[PDB]
Design a binder for this molecule. Structure first.
Ligand SMILES: CCCCCCCC/C=C/CCCCCCCC(=O)OC[C@H](COP(=O)(O)OP(=O)(O)OC[C@H]1O[C@@H](n2ccc(N)nc2=O)[C@H](O)[C@@H]1O)OC(=O)CCCCCCC/C=C/CCCCCCCC
Ligand SMILES: CCCCCCCC/C=C/CCCCCCCC(=O)OC[C@H](COP(=O)(O)OP(=O)(O)OC[C@H]1O[C@@H](n2ccc(N)nc2=O)[C@H](O)[C@@H]1O)OC(=O)CCCCCCC/C=C/CCCCCCCC
Ligand SMILES: CCCCCCCC/C=C/CCCCCCCC(=O)OC[C@H](O)CO
Ligand SMILES: CCCCCCCC/C=C/CCCCCCCC(=O)OC[C@H](O)CO
Ligand SMILES: CCCCCCCC/C=C\CCCCCCCC(=O)OC[C@H](O)CO
Ligand SMILES: CCCCCCCC/C=C\CCCCCCCC(=O)OC[C@H](O)CO
Ligand SMILES: CCCCCCCC/C=C\CCCCCCCC(=O)OC[C@H](O)CO
Ligand SMILES: CCCCCCCC/C=C\CCCCCCCC(=O)OC[C@H](O)CO
Ligand SMILES: CCCCCCCC/C=C\CCCCCCCC(=O)OC[C@H](O)CO
Ligand SMILES: CCCCCCCC/C=C\CCCCCCCC(=O)OC[C@H](O)CO
Ligand SMILES: [Ca+2]
Ligand SMILES: [Ca+2]
Ligand SMILES: [Cl-]
Ligand SMILES: [Cl-]
Ligand SMILES: [Cl-]
Ligand SMILES: [Cl-]
Ligand SMILES: [Cl-]
Ligand SMILES: [Cl-]
Ligand SMILES: [Mg+2]
Ligand SMILES: [Mg+2]
Ligand code: NA
Ligand code: NA
Lengths: 200, 200
């Protein structure tokens, strides 16, 4: 009675490690594990394509992992660490905005992103929460990120190898308590998207 | 900026209420809000069909809400209130099993359930957590529920009117701190499916 076992691919195990790291970010109150979740979220689609184990089941599991790691966990990390009515409302809006763009992304098959992608949104909020000691500013930022995530601002999907290279390293630095470089790279990505949008 | 507003239906707002209650179950450490999420989870599809606003975006938001309310939140409630390594492992397995059945059911389209549905799994775990004061027993039960959820045990999606009637009342009693009746009804449903499976 565990016929589900015949649908699991090797890339699905990468996705489950992502679900584990995203859940443990909440359970253990760990910003560090958010950064690791971004790494696994990049690794699981890569493994699927390289091993030839792409599947509809895995595509769904990948999105479900995003809910955990990048919708719920950052909203929890905001409220847990900046406990306040404003952080409560903002965590709600953040999580809701993550949910809405994942549902839109789930019915879309376009080559870029429409709105800021949810791992970028999660990175911004978590980096802000670690380096800004103000519940008010961080609660404002959560809303701004939420609005960016459900927006029509176009964002590119494939950073070239140079950007991958230095972003990968910045994420591991963030895992070990130095998130500045990852947050700065992620801000440049987000802000450039907005400027292009306003400029036309 | 926000073309997404043109695809949001009235039934999505019910789904959004569900995401809010599921998130707040975590943020506020609230067993009550799990039972309310089950109520909202039944109402959002009902409203979609009665109002003729069934949509693919809404079907995706419905499953995303389930991740939050019924995969992450019960796992968090277990570990947060029975903090221990065994509960940490059991929370992971429960949440992973919820994710796997949601990925499977996202690619499925059968009239019944295959495996124990995830709102029923969440009800069992949180009911057990409220009434059983043992981290070992509840950690065991979390695994058993996870295994049920990913199993091939067939489960009816046909609660006729009398069952809905009393289940709905029992859920509201659970919201106000009396979960025995909801837990009992859910266990009967769960155990019945097991018996029919073994009986062949
Ligand atoms: C443990 C530590 C290990 C050491 C680490 C070693 C290196 C690890 C690689 C990490 C690479 C780091 C790069 C991360 C990329 C990322 O975020 O991916 C997440 C994520 C991409 O993943 P995704 O959307 O899920 O797609 P992907 O996972 O490849 O594949 C999805 C499909 O893959 C198939 N799949 C997936 C999982 C599965 N189990 N089965 C499947 O069949 C299915 O067909 C899926 O539909 O989103 C992003 O890329 C957001 C971009 C954020 C912006 C970056 C910040 C700015 C950076 C530089 C500044 C430049 C500014 C520009 C200005 C000019
Ligand atoms: C407000 C607070 C107070 C108001 C009181 C309101 C009155 C009643 C509330 C009804 C709740 C009671 C019924 C709950 C049933 C339930 O669990 O629903 C969750 C869950 C909800 O169903 P679902 O899987 O999400 O489907 P549903 O939401 O109806 O529809 C999904 C589709 O609806 C469309 N949709 C959905 C959302 C959306 N935003 N847009 C859409 O287009 C899409 O096409 C979706 O694909 O159903 C179950 O899990 C069934 C199994 C539950 C276990 C039963 C436990 C034991 C029961 C009885 C005892 C057994 C033996 C007793 C004998 C003695
Ligand atoms: C920390 C994780 C980071 C990502 C790690 C990526 C690992 C992907 C390996 C692919 C090797 C080729 C795949 C060949 C089949 C898997 C190996 C195997 O022998 O299968 C064992 C079993 O079926 C179940 O893994
Ligand atoms: C230490 C943690 C991070 C370290 C980095 C880990 C990621 C390396 C994974 C590479 C993909 C696996 C490569 C295997 C490619 C061939 C496997 C295979 O059998 O695929 C058949 C063929 O490709 C059908 O298309
Ligand atoms: C810069 C050199 C690269 C650095 C290595 C990158 C590769 C990732 C490897 C392991 C991550 C596992 C570490 C996760 C530790 C768990 C943290 C935890 O338990 O959190 C509790 C609390 O919040 C206190 O932080
Ligand atoms: C149908 C309705 C569905 C949703 C129903 C959920 C309602 C949640 C109620 C109160 C939230 C808690 C706010 C309490 C206000 C401050 C009181 C306090 O104790 O301060 C600490 C606070 O938790 C620091 O944010
Ligand atoms: C409108 C739909 C009908 C159902 C009703 C759903 C209302 C929205 C649901 C949850 C919001 C939870 C609110 C969380 C904040 C608690 C109130 C608070 O403490 O902050 C507010 C203000 O600062 C001083 O009250
Ligand atoms: C007797 C049957 C009739 C009852 C019908 C009820 C219908 C739902 C109405 C309001 C739910 C609001 C729930 C708000 C719960 C507060 C959660 C909270 O603040 O949590 C703090 C602490 O953890 C403690 O749970
Ligand atoms: C707060 C208390 C909570 C419990 C209360 C639950 C209330 C939900 C009941 C009915 C909603 C649906 C009403 C149907 C309105 C139909 C409007 C419409 O668009 O008609 C389309 C047609 O029916 C098809 O194409
Ligand atoms: C491949 C890259 C790594 C991927 C791996 C991702 C998961 C590892 C992250 C955190 C695990 C740390 C959890 C530590 C929890 C310890 C809490 C505990 O129970 O401590 C014992 C107790 O306090 C005394 O009885
Ligand atoms: Ca991915
Ligand atoms: Ca539903
Ligand atoms: Cl199975
Ligand atoms: Cl998108
Ligand atoms: Cl995304
Ligand atoms: Cl939009
Ligand atoms: Cl099913
Ligand atoms: Cl389900
Ligand atoms: Mg993912
Ligand atoms: Mg739902
Ligand atoms: Na796959
Ligand atoms: Na809908």
């Amino acid at each position: 009675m565990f016929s589900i076992r015949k649908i699991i691919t090797i890339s699905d195990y990468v996705t489950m490690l992502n679900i584990i790291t995203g859940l443990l970010a909440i359970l253990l109150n760990s910003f560090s594990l958010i950064y690791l979740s971004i790494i696994f979220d990049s690794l699981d689609g890569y493994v699927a394509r390289k091993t030839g184990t792409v599947s509809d089941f895995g595509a769904e599991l990948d999105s479900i992992s995003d809910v955990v790691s990048f919708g719920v966990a950052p909203a929890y990390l905001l409220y847990n660490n900046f406990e306040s009515n404003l952080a409560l409302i903002s965590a709600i809006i953040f999580c809701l905005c993550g949910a809405l763009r994942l549902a839109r992304f789930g019915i879309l098959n376009v080559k870029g992103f429409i709105g800021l992608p949810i791992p970028a949104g999660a990175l911004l909020l978590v980096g802000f929460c670690q380096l800004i000691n103000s519940y008010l500013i961080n609660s404002i930022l959560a809303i701004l990120i939420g609005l960016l995530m459900i927006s029509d601002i176009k964002y590119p999907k494939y950073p070239n190898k140079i950007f991958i290279y230095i972003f990968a390293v910045s994420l591991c630095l963030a895992i070990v308590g130095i998130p500045h470089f990852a947050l700065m790279l992620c801000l440049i990505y987000a802000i450039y998207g907005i400027i292009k949008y306003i400029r036309g």
